[PDB]
Amino acid sequence: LTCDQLPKAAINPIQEFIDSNPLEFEYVLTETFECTTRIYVQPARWSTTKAPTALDIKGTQIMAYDFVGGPENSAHLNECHTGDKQVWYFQYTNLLTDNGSSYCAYRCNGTEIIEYKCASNNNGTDPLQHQAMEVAKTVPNGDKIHYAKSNCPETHGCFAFY
Amino acid sequence: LTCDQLPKAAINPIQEFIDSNPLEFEYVLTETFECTTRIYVQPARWSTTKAPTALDIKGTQIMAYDFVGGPENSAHLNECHTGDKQVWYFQYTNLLTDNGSSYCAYRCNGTEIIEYKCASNNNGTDPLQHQAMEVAKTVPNGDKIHYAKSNCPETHGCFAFY
Ligand SMILES: *[C@@H]1O[C@H](CO)[C@@H](O)[C@H](O)[C@H]1NC(C)=O
Ligand SMILES: *[C@@H]1O[C@H](CO)[C@@H](O)[C@H](O)[C@H]1NC(C)=O
Ligand SMILES: *[C@@H]1O[C@H](CO)[C@@H](O)[C@H](O)[C@H]1NC(C)=O
Ligand SMILES: *[C@@H]1O[C@H](CO)[C@@H](O)[C@H](O)[C@H]1NC(C)=O
């Protein structure tokens, strides 16, 4: 199996993601998105693209990306500080269940995987999530995929921020 | 007029704030919240306080505060990185109108004002907002209140983030 052959799952309407806030990552590829919270935001009233935004928040640092739909269930992200483009797909989503929400998303470079983000608001207890992670690790460079919360900083009274 | 005598307006239910996302500050007191976007987040499924969170996002930096209600329409904030406490009130709110949402909030130390945050998603066009700012500037230390967006960094394709 190669990264281009992974499933490209249907994307839930944006409000379903917003209603899942806040999420934390359970499995990631590089160190970048360890100990990170995901927040979805609807488009600004003054946005001329009317693209929603994904926020990746790691302590007191934040990466924001406006995103729009592309072909074959892709998300086309524009990183808001640089204007750099990223193309993402979902292996699966399972939002707004009786046990909360999860999904696994990935970014390829051709046949290899270069980033991975499995998110949930149920502490990774959706059996689909572990299952998806085990499939993603089988594509080239998927050996890097690892648990995202092994050594996160101590909290100071909040639950999704530190 | 002193800061303790400013109005302490009714607080809209949290979902009305969430539905106003994203907001930007129009008037602030210190330099801290210049060029800053406000995002409200519902409590995490795993939060034992079930407090919502306010996010103040300034470029790639973020301050998060879980907050709960206190006496006399106060918001009691817990800054998520330090555990430091802040007590806030609203001069007014005007959320989810046909021209969007605005509010002005403040933080006193006794008779003086120490921080001010007027937010909107309509570029400060709610006449209540300019009016509230003109009242707040009359309390001790209100002379510091100023326009929040005079010199913000260039955007790179997004609208509420940079
Ligand atoms: C994929 O890798 C190649 C080789 O380094 C690079 O030129 C390209 O920009 C990368 N990203 C893609 C195709 O999104
Ligand atoms: C979340 O899952 C991790 C890993 O299994 C575990 O160590 C932790 O106790 C869980 N947290 C809760 C609140 O159940
Ligand atoms: C108000 O100012 C006094 C004097 O510096 C300080 O001790 C106190 O902690 C400040 N903050 C309050 C009352 O919230
Ligand atoms: C927002 O208001 C400022 C100050 O009046 C103005 O310079 C700017 O052009 C306004 N933006 C829009 C999109 O109307």
Short mmCIF file of C-alpha atoms and ligand atoms in Angstrom, two decimals:
data_model
loop_
_atom_site.label_atom_id
_atom_site.label_comp_id
_atom_site.label_asym_id
_atom_site.label_seq_id
_atom_site.Cartn_x
_atom_site.Cartn_y
_atom_site.Cartn_z
CA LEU A 1 0.00 0.00 0.00
CA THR A 2 1.19 3.55 -0.86
CA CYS A 3 -0.06 6.95 0.36
CA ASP A 4 -1.91 7.72 -2.90
CA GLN A 5 -3.95 4.51 -2.40
CA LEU A 6 -5.25 5.42 1.06
CA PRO A 7 -9.00 6.11 1.29
CA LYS A 8 -10.21 9.62 0.46
CA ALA A 9 -13.29 9.74 2.68
CA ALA A 10 -16.29 12.05 2.35
CA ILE A 11 -15.87 15.36 4.16
CA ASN A 12 -18.59 16.19 6.68
CA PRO A 13 -20.15 19.61 6.39
CA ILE A 14 -18.01 22.18 8.21
CA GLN A 15 -20.53 22.74 11.02
CA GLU A 16 -20.08 19.09 12.12
CA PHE A 17 -16.37 19.76 12.63
CA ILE A 18 -17.09 23.03 14.46
CA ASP A 19 -19.55 21.20 16.72
CA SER A 20 -16.76 18.71 17.56
CA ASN A 21 -14.44 21.43 18.99
CA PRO A 22 -12.14 21.08 20.84
CA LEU A 23 -10.23 18.05 19.54
CA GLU A 24 -6.77 16.77 20.43
CA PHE A 25 -4.42 14.77 18.27
CA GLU A 26 -3.90 11.11 19.18
CA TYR A 27 -1.48 10.03 16.44
CA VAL A 28 0.83 12.22 14.38
CA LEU A 29 3.83 11.70 12.07
CA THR A 30 6.46 14.41 12.72
CA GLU A 31 6.98 15.97 16.16
CA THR A 32 5.17 19.12 15.00
CA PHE A 33 1.62 18.19 16.05
CA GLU A 34 2.40 16.38 19.28
CA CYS A 35 0.44 17.78 22.24
CA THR A 36 -1.77 19.83 19.93
CA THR A 37 -5.41 20.90 20.01
CA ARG A 38 -7.50 21.34 16.83
CA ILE A 39 -10.20 24.05 16.61
CA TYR A 40 -12.39 24.66 13.56
CA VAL A 41 -13.69 28.13 12.80
CA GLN A 42 -16.40 29.24 10.36
CA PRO A 43 -15.41 31.91 7.82
CA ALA A 44 -15.15 35.50 8.97
CA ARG A 45 -18.07 37.74 7.97
CA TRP A 46 -15.50 39.86 6.10
CA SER A 47 -13.74 36.93 4.36
CA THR A 48 -14.04 37.22 0.58
CA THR A 49 -13.14 33.53 0.09
CA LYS A 50 -15.60 32.46 2.82
CA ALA A 51 -13.17 29.63 3.63
CA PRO A 52 -13.35 28.16 7.14
CA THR A 53 -10.17 27.89 9.20
CA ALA A 54 -8.41 25.05 11.02
CA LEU A 55 -6.32 25.97 14.07
CA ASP A 56 -3.50 23.80 15.40
CA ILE A 57 -2.70 25.06 18.90
CA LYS A 58 0.36 23.77 20.79
CA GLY A 59 0.71 25.55 24.12
CA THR A 60 1.04 29.27 23.38
CA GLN A 61 1.84 28.74 19.65
CA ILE A 62 -0.75 28.54 16.88
CA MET A 63 -0.78 27.59 13.19
CA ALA A 64 -3.91 28.66 11.27
CA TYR A 65 -4.95 27.57 7.80
CA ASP A 66 -7.96 28.73 5.79
CA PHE A 67 -9.14 25.77 3.72
CA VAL A 68 -11.38 25.04 0.74
CA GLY A 69 -12.53 21.86 -0.99
CA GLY A 70 -10.71 20.43 -3.95
CA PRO A 71 -11.09 17.37 -6.17
CA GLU A 72 -11.59 13.88 -4.74
CA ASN A 73 -12.49 14.95 -1.19
CA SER A 74 -9.33 16.98 -0.73
CA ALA A 75 -8.82 19.89 1.64
CA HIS A 76 -6.66 22.68 0.22
CA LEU A 77 -5.06 24.55 3.12
CA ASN A 78 -3.48 28.03 2.98
CA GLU A 79 -1.22 28.49 6.04
CA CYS A 80 -2.14 31.96 7.22
CA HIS A 81 1.33 33.23 8.21
CA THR A 82 3.22 32.12 5.05
CA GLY A 83 0.62 31.49 2.32
CA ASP A 84 2.06 27.98 1.92
CA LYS A 85 -0.28 25.38 0.44
CA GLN A 86 -1.03 21.88 1.72
CA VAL A 87 -3.31 19.15 0.35
CA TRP A 88 -5.00 16.87 2.88
CA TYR A 89 -7.38 13.89 2.76
CA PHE A 90 -9.33 11.93 5.37
CA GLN A 91 -8.88 8.18 5.83
CA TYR A 92 -12.23 8.33 7.62
CA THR A 93 -14.38 10.55 9.79
CA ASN A 94 -16.75 9.59 12.56
CA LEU A 95 -18.18 12.82 13.93
CA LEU A 96 -20.88 13.54 16.51
CA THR A 97 -21.53 10.00 17.74
CA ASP A 98 -22.72 9.07 21.24
CA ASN A 99 -19.00 8.64 22.10
CA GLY A 100 -17.96 11.96 20.49
CA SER A 101 -15.92 12.58 17.35
CA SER A 102 -12.83 11.23 15.67
CA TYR A 103 -11.10 11.34 12.31
CA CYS A 104 -7.74 10.54 10.74
CA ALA A 105 -6.29 12.83 8.08
CA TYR A 106 -3.09 12.63 6.07
CA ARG A 107 -0.81 14.49 3.71
CA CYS A 108 1.12 12.64 1.00
CA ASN A 109 4.01 13.40 -1.23
CA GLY A 110 3.22 10.95 -3.99
CA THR A 111 3.62 7.42 -2.66
CA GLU A 112 4.98 8.45 0.77
CA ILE A 113 3.18 9.95 3.75
CA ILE A 114 4.68 13.22 5.07
CA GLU A 115 2.21 14.19 7.83
CA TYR A 116 -0.56 12.46 9.77
CA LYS A 117 -3.21 13.85 12.12
CA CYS A 118 -5.65 11.55 13.97
CA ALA A 119 -7.91 13.74 16.13
CA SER A 120 -10.62 13.04 18.67
CA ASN A 121 -12.54 14.40 21.62
CA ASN A 122 -12.88 10.97 23.27
CA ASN A 123 -9.21 10.29 24.09
CA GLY A 124 -8.73 7.95 21.11
CA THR A 125 -11.39 5.41 22.18
CA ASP A 126 -13.06 5.15 18.74
CA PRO A 127 -11.96 1.71 17.46
CA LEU A 128 -11.84 3.15 13.91
CA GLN A 129 -8.95 5.41 14.98
CA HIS A 130 -6.45 2.74 16.11
CA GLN A 131 -7.49 0.73 13.03
CA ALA A 132 -6.81 3.65 10.66
CA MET A 133 -3.44 4.34 12.31
CA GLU A 134 -2.43 0.70 11.74
CA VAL A 135 -3.24 1.01 8.01
CA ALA A 136 -1.44 4.36 7.62
CA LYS A 137 1.77 3.02 9.19
CA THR A 138 1.99 0.50 6.29
CA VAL A 139 2.56 3.14 3.57
CA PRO A 140 6.09 4.43 2.84
CA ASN A 141 7.33 6.62 5.74
CA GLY A 142 4.33 5.53 7.86
CA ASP A 143 6.86 4.05 10.30
CA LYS A 144 7.14 7.57 11.76
CA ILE A 145 3.52 7.62 12.96
CA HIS A 146 3.41 7.65 16.75
CA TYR A 147 1.31 8.54 19.79
CA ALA A 148 0.90 12.30 20.11
CA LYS A 149 0.50 12.66 23.89
CA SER A 150 3.38 10.72 25.50
CA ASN A 151 5.06 13.74 27.18
CA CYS A 152 2.83 16.82 27.20
CA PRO A 153 3.41 19.78 29.56
CA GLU A 154 1.56 20.06 32.87
CA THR A 155 -1.80 21.83 32.80
CA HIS A 156 -2.65 24.98 34.80
CA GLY A 157 -6.40 24.58 35.26
CA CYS A 158 -7.65 24.13 31.68
CA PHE A 159 -8.26 20.93 29.71
CA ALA A 160 -7.53 21.52 26.00
CA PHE A 161 -4.88 24.24 26.49
CA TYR A 162 -1.65 24.57 28.49
CA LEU B 1 -17.13 57.98 36.54
CA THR B 2 -14.86 55.17 37.85
CA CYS B 3 -14.29 51.62 36.54
CA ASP B 4 -16.40 50.01 39.29
CA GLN B 5 -19.38 52.14 38.15
CA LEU B 6 -19.32 50.96 34.53
CA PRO B 7 -22.29 48.83 33.44
CA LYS B 8 -22.14 45.10 34.13
CA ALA B 9 -24.28 43.85 31.24
CA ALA B 10 -26.07 40.51 30.96
CA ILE B 11 -23.92 37.75 29.47
CA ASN B 12 -25.38 36.03 26.42
CA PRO B 13 -25.45 32.26 26.50
CA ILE B 14 -22.08 30.87 25.39
CA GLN B 15 -23.40 29.49 22.09
CA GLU B 16 -24.21 33.05 20.93
CA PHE B 17 -20.54 33.97 21.37
CA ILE B 18 -19.42 30.79 19.59
CA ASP B 19 -21.78 31.59 16.72
CA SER B 20 -20.12 35.03 16.45
CA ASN B 21 -16.63 33.56 15.77
CA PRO B 22 -14.29 34.90 14.51
CA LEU B 23 -14.14 38.37 16.08
CA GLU B 24 -11.39 40.98 15.98
CA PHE B 25 -10.65 43.65 18.54
CA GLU B 26 -11.45 47.25 17.59
CA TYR B 27 -10.42 49.07 20.78
CA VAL B 28 -7.99 47.90 23.44
CA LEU B 29 -6.11 49.47 26.38
CA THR B 30 -2.54 48.09 26.53
CA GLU B 31 -0.62 47.05 23.40
CA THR B 32 -1.22 43.38 24.25
CA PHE B 33 -4.48 42.85 22.33
CA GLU B 34 -3.73 44.98 19.29
CA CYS B 35 -4.18 43.07 16.02
CA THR B 36 -5.86 40.18 17.83
CA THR B 37 -8.63 37.74 16.93
CA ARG B 38 -11.06 36.32 19.53
CA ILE B 39 -12.40 32.75 19.23
CA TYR B 40 -14.82 31.15 21.69
CA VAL B 41 -14.76 27.41 22.29
CA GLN B 42 -17.28 25.19 24.06
CA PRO B 43 -15.95 23.01 26.89
CA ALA B 44 -14.00 19.90 26.04
CA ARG B 45 -15.91 16.62 26.41
CA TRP B 46 -13.24 15.63 28.95
CA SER B 47 -13.29 18.92 30.92
CA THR B 48 -14.35 18.34 34.52
CA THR B 49 -15.17 22.05 35.02
CA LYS B 50 -17.11 22.18 31.72
CA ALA B 51 -15.91 25.78 31.38
CA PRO B 52 -15.81 27.24 27.86
CA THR B 53 -12.62 28.87 26.62
CA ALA B 54 -11.77 32.27 25.13
CA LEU B 55 -8.82 32.43 22.73
CA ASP B 56 -6.89 35.63 22.02
CA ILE B 57 -4.83 34.98 18.88
CA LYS B 58 -2.18 37.49 17.72
CA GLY B 59 -0.36 36.17 14.67
CA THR B 60 1.26 32.88 15.66
CA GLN B 61 0.85 33.49 19.44
CA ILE B 62 -2.19 32.48 21.49
CA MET B 63 -3.49 33.14 25.01
CA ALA B 64 -6.28 30.81 26.17
CA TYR B 65 -8.48 31.20 29.22
CA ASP B 66 -11.15 28.83 30.50
CA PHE B 67 -13.89 30.94 32.07
CA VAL B 68 -16.88 30.54 34.38
CA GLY B 69 -19.60 32.90 35.60
CA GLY B 70 -19.28 34.79 38.85
CA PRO B 71 -21.39 37.31 40.74
CA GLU B 72 -22.90 40.37 39.05
CA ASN B 73 -22.40 39.21 35.45
CA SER B 74 -18.68 38.66 35.87
CA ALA B 75 -16.48 36.33 33.85
CA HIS B 76 -13.80 34.59 35.90
CA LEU B 77 -10.93 33.67 33.57
CA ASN B 78 -8.16 31.13 34.27
CA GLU B 79 -5.24 31.77 31.88
CA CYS B 80 -4.37 28.30 30.69
CA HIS B 81 -0.55 28.59 30.63
CA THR B 82 -0.10 30.20 34.09
CA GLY B 83 -3.31 29.59 36.08
CA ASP B 84 -3.55 33.36 36.64
CA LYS B 85 -7.02 34.71 37.37
CA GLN B 86 -8.79 37.67 35.76
CA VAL B 87 -12.23 39.17 36.40
CA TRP B 88 -14.03 40.70 33.42
CA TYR B 89 -17.36 42.45 32.81
CA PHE B 90 -19.25 43.59 29.71
CA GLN B 91 -20.25 47.22 29.17
CA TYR B 92 -22.71 45.82 26.64
CA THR B 93 -23.19 43.04 24.13
CA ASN B 94 -25.01 43.11 20.82
CA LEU B 95 -24.63 39.65 19.31
CA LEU B 96 -26.09 38.03 16.20
CA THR B 97 -27.80 41.06 14.67
CA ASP B 98 -28.38 41.62 10.94
CA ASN B 99 -25.07 43.56 10.99
CA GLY B 100 -23.19 40.86 12.97
CA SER B 101 -21.90 40.95 16.53
CA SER B 102 -20.13 43.36 18.84
CA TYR B 103 -19.37 43.78 22.52
CA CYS B 104 -17.11 45.78 24.82
CA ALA B 105 -15.55 44.13 27.86
CA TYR B 106 -13.29 45.50 30.57
CA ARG B 107 -11.10 44.61 33.50
CA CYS B 108 -10.80 46.94 36.51
CA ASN B 109 -8.48 47.29 39.40
CA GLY B 110 -10.83 49.07 41.75
CA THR B 111 -11.59 52.52 40.38
CA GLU B 112 -9.14 52.31 37.44
CA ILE B 113 -9.41 50.37 34.20
CA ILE B 114 -6.44 48.06 33.45
CA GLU B 115 -7.56 46.32 30.23
CA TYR B 116 -10.23 46.87 27.59
CA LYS B 117 -11.44 44.66 24.74
CA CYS B 118 -14.08 45.87 22.24
CA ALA B 119 -14.67 43.07 19.72
CA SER B 120 -16.73 42.74 16.56
CA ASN B 121 -17.16 40.88 13.31
CA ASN B 122 -18.44 43.96 11.45
CA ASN B 123 -15.28 46.11 11.51
CA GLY B 124 -16.52 48.29 14.39
CA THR B 125 -19.64 49.58 12.58
CA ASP B 126 -22.05 48.97 15.50
CA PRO B 127 -22.77 52.49 16.83
CA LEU B 128 -22.94 51.04 20.37
CA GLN B 129 -19.22 50.20 20.14
CA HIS B 130 -17.83 53.71 19.52
CA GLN B 131 -20.30 54.96 22.15
CA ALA B 132 -19.09 52.45 24.75
CA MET B 133 -15.44 53.27 24.01
CA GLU B 134 -16.15 56.97 24.61
CA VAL B 135 -17.64 56.16 28.05
CA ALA B 136 -14.80 53.81 29.03
CA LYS B 137 -12.13 56.41 28.22
CA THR B 138 -13.65 58.65 30.96
CA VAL B 139 -12.74 56.33 33.87
CA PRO B 140 -9.28 56.54 35.50
CA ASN B 141 -6.60 55.19 33.09
CA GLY B 142 -9.18 55.08 30.26
CA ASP B 143 -6.95 57.59 28.43
CA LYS B 144 -4.93 54.55 27.27
CA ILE B 145 -7.81 53.11 25.23
CA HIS B 146 -6.98 53.23 21.54
CA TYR B 147 -7.74 51.74 18.13
CA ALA B 148 -6.51 48.15 17.92
CA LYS B 149 -5.80 47.86 14.18
CA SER B 150 -3.65 50.87 13.21
CA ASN B 151 -0.55 48.88 12.15
CA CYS B 152 -1.26 45.17 11.74
CA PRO B 153 1.01 42.82 9.75
CA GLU B 154 0.29 41.99 6.11
CA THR B 155 -1.98 39.01 5.46
CA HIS B 156 -0.97 35.90 3.48
CA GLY B 157 -4.33 34.77 2.11
CA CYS B 158 -6.48 34.50 5.25
CA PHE B 159 -8.78 37.06 6.85
CA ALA B 160 -8.80 36.63 10.64
CA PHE B 161 -5.24 35.24 10.96
CA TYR B 162 -1.78 36.34 9.82
C1 LIG C 1 7.31 16.55 -2.93
O1 LIG C 1 8.72 16.31 -3.00
C2 LIG C 1 9.37 16.97 -4.10
C3 LIG C 1 10.86 16.61 -4.10
O2 LIG C 1 11.51 17.20 -2.97
C4 LIG C 1 9.16 18.49 -4.04
O3 LIG C 1 9.74 19.11 -5.19
C5 LIG C 1 7.66 18.81 -3.96
O4 LIG C 1 7.44 20.22 -3.81
C6 LIG C 1 7.08 18.06 -2.77
N1 LIG C 1 5.69 18.43 -2.46
C7 LIG C 1 4.55 18.20 -3.15
C8 LIG C 1 4.52 17.45 -4.45
O5 LIG C 1 3.50 18.61 -2.68
C1 LIG C 2 -6.52 8.77 27.92
O1 LIG C 2 -5.83 7.68 27.32
C2 LIG C 2 -4.49 7.52 27.82
C3 LIG C 2 -3.79 6.41 27.04
O2 LIG C 2 -4.54 5.19 27.09
C4 LIG C 2 -4.54 7.22 29.33
O3 LIG C 2 -3.21 7.17 29.87
C5 LIG C 2 -5.35 8.28 30.07
O4 LIG C 2 -5.53 7.89 31.43
C6 LIG C 2 -6.71 8.47 29.41
N1 LIG C 2 -7.43 9.56 30.04
C7 LIG C 2 -8.66 9.44 30.56
C8 LIG C 2 -9.22 10.69 31.17
O5 LIG C 2 -9.29 8.40 30.55
C1 LIG C 3 -4.71 45.66 42.01
O1 LIG C 3 -3.58 46.44 42.40
C2 LIG C 3 -3.00 46.05 43.66
C3 LIG C 3 -1.84 46.98 44.00
O2 LIG C 3 -0.75 46.76 43.10
C4 LIG C 3 -2.56 44.58 43.63
O3 LIG C 3 -2.07 44.19 44.92
C5 LIG C 3 -3.73 43.69 43.21
O4 LIG C 3 -3.32 42.32 43.08
C6 LIG C 3 -4.26 44.20 41.87
N1 LIG C 3 -5.27 43.32 41.26
C7 LIG C 3 -6.53 43.03 41.64
C8 LIG C 3 -7.18 43.63 42.86
O5 LIG C 3 -7.18 42.25 40.96
C1 LIG C 4 -12.59 48.78 8.37
O1 LIG C 4 -12.57 50.02 9.06
C2 LIG C 4 -11.34 50.74 8.89
C3 LIG C 4 -11.35 51.99 9.76
O2 LIG C 4 -12.49 52.81 9.47
C4 LIG C 4 -11.13 51.07 7.41
O3 LIG C 4 -9.85 51.68 7.20
C5 LIG C 4 -11.24 49.81 6.55
O4 LIG C 4 -11.23 50.17 5.16
C6 LIG C 4 -12.53 49.06 6.87
N1 LIG C 4 -12.57 47.80 6.14
C7 LIG C 4 -13.57 47.44 5.33
C8 LIG C 4 -13.42 46.10 4.67
O5 LIG C 4 -14.55 48.14 5.13
#
